[PDB]
């Protein structure tokens, strides 16, 4: 079974997995740095605005 869906505040960092796909270090809304977790990109639901903000212009 999946972990629960939690609300995202922002993306803190990113890295490639062994298969060449992004993982994102997530700042969870209502939490701080202590609670950040690395999540594969396929865990993200409609989070393109957070990815685009992180990557910048």
């Amino acid at each position: 079974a999946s972990g629960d869906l939690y609300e995202v505040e922002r993306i803190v960092d990113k890295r490639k997995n062994k298969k060449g796909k992004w993982e994102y270090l997530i700042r969870w809304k209502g939490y701080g740095s202590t609670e950040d977790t690395w999540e594969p990109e396929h865990h993200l639901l409609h989070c393109e605005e957070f990815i685009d903000e992180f990557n910048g212009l």
């Binding site: 999946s2 629960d4 869906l5 939690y6 969870w28 977790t37 999540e39 639901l45 989070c47």
Partner: peptide, 5 residues
């Protein structure tokens, strides 16, 4: 939202 593992 995202799945938190």
């Amino acid at each position: 939202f995202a799945l938190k593992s």
